[PDB]
Symmetry: none
Subunit: 220 residues, 2 copies
């Protein structure tokens, strides 16, 4: 139909897939050339990324992520799969890497929690999630629901250069993200005090700083 299932564009673009013959949120491409080009679509092409409601192969990857049906974006329902991805390479499916996913909260400009659990996850880890002020500089604020953030924000491990508490404190280079916060629990038990992990949000490579039982933030 007119409205078809898609990922948040950057999920495919980080993967190398910038054009689509059918999906609206990407570059347009003629229906012929899609067979001779790496594209993102709902239909099967030899080199492509196939986005779909159902599963297609065993190597398909389910993503509990932000999504869009046609033009409008929608936030993720946390536990539930939003779409399966299937990376076709030379007319034969390939395994996708591991990655976390942005919830679609940035593009809807919503600063509210998805779950009750995530709300609990916020007050459990206040500094990282809710932010904190420390002598003319903002302390944490790693998430889109955090305070001291500006009215408007871009996308995917967003270095929102600016976090303010008016006439009091400010950090010039604060980094935030709209991923389901309790997805970070597995990385919050390092055997060392500090630990750095190479991760993917929306298939963009980025680091995750963690101090055990104190603070964390994703960082590009």
């Amino acid at each position: 139909g007119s409205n078809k299932i898609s990922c948040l564009p950057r999920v495919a673009q980080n993967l190398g897939y910038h054009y689509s013959p059918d999906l609206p949120g990407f570059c347009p491409i003629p229906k012929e050339l899609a067979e001779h080009w790496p594209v993102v679509s709902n239909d099967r092409y030899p080199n492509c990324l196939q986005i779909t409601l159902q599963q297609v192969c065993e190597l398909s990857k389910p993503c509990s992520a932000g999504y869009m049906v046609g033009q409008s974006v929608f936030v993720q329902t946390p536990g539930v799969t939003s779409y399966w991805l299937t990376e076709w390479v030379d007319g034969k499916a390939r395994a996708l890497p591991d990655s976390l996913f942005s919830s679609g909260r940035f593009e809807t400009n919503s600063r509210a929690f998805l779950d009750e659990a995530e709300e609990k996850f916020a007050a459990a880890h206040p500094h990282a999630c809710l932010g904190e002020i420390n002598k003319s500089t903002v302390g944490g604020s790693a998430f889109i629901f955090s305070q001291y953030l500006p009215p408007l924000l871009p996308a995917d491990a967003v270095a929102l250069v600016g976090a303010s508490l008016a006439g009091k404190a400010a950090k010039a280079a604060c980094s935030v993200v709209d991923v389901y916060a309790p997805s970070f629990e597995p990385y919050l038990h390092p055997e060392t005090l500090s630990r750095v992990y190479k991760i993917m949000i929306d298939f963009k490579p980025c680091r995750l700083m963690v101090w055990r039982n104190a603070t964390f933030y994703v960082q590009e």
Copy 2:
């Protein structure tokens, strides 16, 4: 008083020049301060990359390439020199490195052969003309004139060689080679079977693989 002749800014930016008192394609800077910092300009300063319509001295580098007079960009008229480049360092001129250059088709929405000769050259070298990864093996196996490229080539999705991939995307869709194709000819006759020439496009270093009488591609 003065015309505003200029290179495609990446040419100077790859050379490590970002400011200009006169030329509009760069970061502005006051003429007063032009003495005390490296600039790109049509005038001479103590430290400067001078651009001009004709040669200044023996060390001046003639460039047949895409250019711009003022704000507006022009495609290279192949055969003829577009501008001369003259690097000044502490008053004295310095020999610039050699380089290939981009023709300017990318930033004027063009997909055309500049010459009849270029159309011939692509016919003469079919393995740097059709395909993407089939005949050459860089990720961006694509001249800008290729049928196999998409009609649209926005900088945030495609990696113009000479420049970088724009925006936050991790992997580019491809890499567009927007450069007059017969200018590769000096590197097309190695004495060995394979050769990897260390070369420059717009003074940005890169490797050019050359399988003799077969194919070639920038990396």
